[PDB]
Amino acid sequence: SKAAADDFKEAFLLFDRTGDAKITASQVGDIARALGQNPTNAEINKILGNPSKEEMNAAAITFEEFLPMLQAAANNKDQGTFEDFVEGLRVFDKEGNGTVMGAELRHVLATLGEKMTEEEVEELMKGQEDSNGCINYEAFVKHIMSV
Amino acid sequence: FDETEIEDFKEAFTVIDQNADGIIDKDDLRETFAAMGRLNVKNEELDAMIKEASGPINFTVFLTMFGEKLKGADPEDVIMGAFKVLDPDGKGSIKKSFLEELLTTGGGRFTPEEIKNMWAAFPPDVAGNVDYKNICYVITHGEDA
Amino acid sequence: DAEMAAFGEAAPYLRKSEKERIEAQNKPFDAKSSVFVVHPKQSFVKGTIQSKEGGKVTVKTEGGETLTVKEDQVFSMNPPKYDKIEDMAMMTHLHEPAVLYNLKERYAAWMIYTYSGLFCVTVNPYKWLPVYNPKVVLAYRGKKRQEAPPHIFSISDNAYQFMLTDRENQSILITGESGAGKTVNTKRVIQYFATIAA
Amino acid sequence: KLLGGGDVDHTQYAFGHTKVFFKAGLLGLLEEMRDDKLAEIITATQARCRGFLMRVEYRAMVERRESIFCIQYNVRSFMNVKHWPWMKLFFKIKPLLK
C-alpha cells in the first residue's frame, strides 16, 4: 500500500542477477519468503498454474506481476500460529520435556510432505542440537521464528 | 562510536591538552611529544596536524576528525565475532587460502592486491588467516605489539 | 482381518475386508449438500441439494430426478464414517431414512445382522449362508458384542455369560411378521444353547 | 478443554467419567470440520518449514554479509590512520593508561 514499502523493489534488485529488473518465476517462492512471507511450496505452485503460468519453461519477470503476487500471499500469513508448531513437536515425543531425538526430526523434515534437502535440515539443527542427540524444540522453534 | 571508545578519546585529549583549557594548540602537541621522548619534533609536523582541522582542536573537533578517518573502525570484540563466524567450530585459526578466496569472492574490498598488502605487515599467520586475534589487536591499536 | 479367522469363510457375511471398510469410510463427502429426501413413489431416496426456496427444497436424485420438497421432507446424511455401522444407534443421524438405508446397504452386501441399539436386527437372506457355521458357533463363544460383529449368537452367548456372571435369569424376545423367519432363528438359538452347554 | 473453542452449542454435549455425550449429528459435525482440516493438511506445517528452510540459506549465502563489511571497513581505517600523528601519539600513550 506503501504504507508504500519501496524496499521490496530494492530487494528485487538484489535478487536479479542480470540487472534488467526482472526475476524468474523459480525465484519468486524464495523471495516471498525473504520479504517476510511463508507460502508453502504447493501454494506457490498452484497459484502459478492457476494463472496458466508454467514454471517448467523459461520465465522472466516484471515487478508489476511480482508485487501483486506478494500481496496475494500476504493474506495467508494468518496461518503462522506458533501454538500449533510447538504442539506438533510436543505430540512427536513422549515425556514432559520438549526434546526430539536428532534423526527423528531430520528424517521427518526431509521425507514428510514438502521435501527439505538434508543439507538444509542440517543447517537448521546446527547449534540447537548438542551431542546428546536431543533437540530442544522450545528453543528450536523460538530460533526458527527469530528469522 | 560506543561510549567507552569516546571516553578513551576524551582521556587521550586530556593527555595531549596539558594546559587543560579544552583546546589542543601546537604547544600542547609539542609538549606531549617531548614527554614521550620526541626532542626533535619539528614544527611542520605540528602544523600538518593542525592543517587537518578547520578550527581549534576542542573535544568535538577532535572527535569529528577521528570519525572521518575511522569510518570503518571496528572494536576488537566485533572483529572476533566475525572471525568466530568464519571459524564456527572454535579455537582454530582459519586457512590462508580460505580468507583470500572469501575476501575476493564476496566483495570488491577483498580483491587480491589488497590481500597482498594484508599479508605484508600483518604477518604470515595473520596474513594466511591461520592465527587470529593479533590482527584484531592491531586494527584497534596499530603497530607491532 | 487378522482377527477374523475363526469365521474365515463366514467373515465376508459378518464383516468386510479392512480396506473395503477403509475405502468406504475414507471418501469424499459434502455434508451441506448431501441429503435424504421424501419421495412419492419410493419412500425415501437420496439426493443432492440444489437450491433453497426459503422453506422449500429442490433436490437432485440418485437416478436423476428433481423435486421441490418442504424443509422437513429433507433429512441429513451421515458422513461416510458410518457406512455399514454395526450399531445404527451410533450414528449421529437418527432419522427414519438413515436407518432404512443402513440396513439396506449391509444387506446388498449380504450382511443380515445389524444392531439398532439393543436390538439385533435380522434380515431374511432368501438363500444359504455359512453363518450358522459350526465354526462361528465357537467364535462367538465367550465374546462381548463389541469383540465381534453383529450376530445372533452374540446375543445368545452374552445371555449365557450374563447368566452366570450376574446370577440373573435371561430372555430373548424374537419377533417379526409371518415371513420374517423367526422359528428358524428360534430354533437356531436353541441349538446354540444345547451345544455350548451340554 | 478442547471444546473450549468453536461456535458450537455447549449444551448439546455432556461429559462423564469415560466419555462425552453428544446429541445428533454432532460427531458428524465434528468430523466435517476435521475433513476440511485435512484438505489443508501438514501442508501448512510444511510450508513454514520450506520457507524457513530457505530463510537460513539466505543468512549463509548471506550470514557473512556483514561480518565482511565489518572486516572490510575496519581495515581501511587503520591504513589511513596508522600514518596520523594523533593516532601514533594515542598509540605510544595508550599504554600508560589504565
- List the beta strands (DSSP E) in A102-143: 134-136
DSSP 3-state assignment of D92?
helix
Q: Which residues of B55-93 are buried (b: 16+ CB within 10 A; e: fewer)?
A: eebebebbeebbeebbebbbbeebbbbbbeebeeeeeeb
**Across the interface, which of D22, D24, D32 has its CB nearest the CB of C79?**
D32
DSSP 3-state assignment of A129?
strand
Contacts of B77 in chain D (CB under 8 A): none
- List the beta strands (DSSP E) in chain C: 34-38, 44-52, 56-59, 67-70, 74-76, 113-115, 120-122
The answer to whether A14 faces chain D, any CB pair under 8 Å, is: no
Any bridge partners for residue D13, and if so which? D22
Q: Distance between CA atoms of C114 and B110, rounded to whole angstroms? A: 82
Our CA-based measurement puts residue D80 at a distance from the nearest CA of chain B, in whole angstroms, of: 7
The answer to whether D43 faces chain A, any CB pair under 8 Å, is: yes
Say yes or no for a CB contact (<8 Å) between B33 and D93: no
Our CA-based measurement puts residue A98 at a distance from the nearest CA of chain D, in whole angstroms, of: 18
Contacts of C194 (CB under 8 A, 6+ apart): none
Q: What angle do CA C85, C87, C91 make, to 5 degrees?
A: 70
Question: Which chain D residue lies closest to C89 (C-alpha atoms)?
Answer: D24
Q: Distance between CA atoms of B83 and B94, rounded to whole angstroms? A: 9
Q: Distance between CA atoms of D65 and B143, rounded to whole angstroms? A: 29
The answer to whether C29 faces chain D, any CB pair under 8 Å, is: yes
The answer to whether A42 faces chain D, any CB pair under 8 Å, is: yes
Q: Distance between CA atoms of D13 and D26, rounded to whole angstroms? A: 9
How far separated are the first and last CA of chain B, in Å rounded?
Answer: 24
Contacts of D82 in chain B (CB under 8 A): 142-143
DSSP label of B143: S
Residue of D78, D87, D94 to mutate, interface with B, max B Cβ within 10 Å? D78
Q: Distance between CA atoms of B134 and D51, rounded to whole angstroms? A: 40
Of D66, A121, A119, which is closest to residue B85 (Cα–Cα)?
A: D66
Contacts of D61 (CB under 8 A, 6+ apart): none
Q: Do chains C and B touch (3 or more CB pairs under 8 A)?
A: no
Q: What angle do CA C181, C182, C185 make, to 5 degrees?
A: 105
How far separated are the first and last CA of chain A, in Å rounded?
Answer: 24
A75: burial class by Cβ within 10 Å (0-12, 13-18, 19+)? Answer: exposed
Helices (H), chain B: 3-16, 26-35, 43-50, 59-69, 76-86, 96-104, 112-119, 124-128, 134-140
Contacts of B69 in chain D (CB under 8 A): 77, 80-81, 84, 87
Cα torsion C78, C80, C86, C90: sign: negative
What subunits touch chain B, counting only 3 or more CB pairs under 8 A? D
Q: Distance between CA atoms of B59 and B69, rounded to whole angstroms? A: 16
Any bridge partners for residue C58, and if so which? C51, C68
Contacts of C110 (CB under 8 A, 6+ apart): C12, C13, C125, C129
Contacts of C157 (CB under 8 A, 6+ apart): C140, C141, C142, C143, C192, C196
Question: Grid coordinates in use for C156?
Answer: 445368545
Q: Distance between CA atoms of D49 and C182, rounded to whole angstroms? A: 63
Q: Distance between CA atoms of D72 and C168, rounded to whole angstroms? A: 94
Question: Grid coordinates in use for C129?
Answer: 449362508
User: Under an 8 Å CB criterion, which residues of D touch B?
Assistant: 63-64, 66-78, 80-82, 84-94, 96-97
The answer to whether B67 faces chain D, any CB pair under 8 Å, is: no
Specify binding-site residues of C for ATP: 176-183
Our CA-based measurement puts residue D19 at a distance from the nearest CA of chain C, in whole angstroms, of: 14
Specify binding-site residues of B for Ca(2+): 17, 19, 21, 28
CA A45 to chain centre: 13
Question: Grid coordinates in use for B41?
Answer: 619534533
Of C68, C106, C70, which is closest to residue C85 (Cα–Cα)?
A: C106
**Across the interface, which of C29, C79, C93 has its CB nearest the CB of D24?**
C93
DSSP letters along D33-81, please? HHHHHHHT-SHHHHHHHHHHHHHHHHHHHHHHHHHHHHHHHHHHHHHHH
Residue with cell 526482472: A22
Tell me the CA distances in angstroms from C75 to A94, C12, C34, one per residue in order. 44, 31, 9
Residue of B5, B15, B43 to mutate, interface with D, max D Cβ within 10 Å? B15
Of C103, C97, C65, which is closest to residue C84 (Cα–Cα)?
A: C103
Contacts of C94 in chain D (CB under 8 A): 24-25
CB C45 within 8 A of CB C62: yes
Contacts of B118 in chain D (CB under 8 A): 75
Q: After which residues is chain B broken (C to N over 2.5 A)?
A: none
Of B105, B100, B108, which is closest to residue B126 (Cα–Cα)?
A: B100
CB-facing half-sphere around the CA of C158: CA atoms within 13 A? 16
What subunits touch chain A, counting only 3 or more CB pairs under 8 A? D
**In the sheet that C44-52 helps form, which strands lie side by side, from edge to edge?**
C67-70, C56-59, C44-52, C34-38, C74-76
The answer to whether D32 faces chain C, any CB pair under 8 Å, is: yes
Say yes or no for a CB contact (<8 Å) between D25 and C92: yes
Our CA-based measurement puts residue D60 at a distance from the nearest CA of chain A, in whole angstroms, of: 9
Q: Distance between CA atoms of C132 and C181, rounded to whole angstroms? A: 14
Q: Do chains B and D touch (3 or more CB pairs under 8 A)?
A: yes
Contacts of D32 in chain C (CB under 8 A): 29, 31, 79
Q: Distance between CA atoms of A70 and A9, rounded to whole angstroms? A: 12
- State the CB neighbour count (10 A cutoff) for residue C15: 20
Say yes or no for a CB contact (<8 Å) between D29 and C92: yes
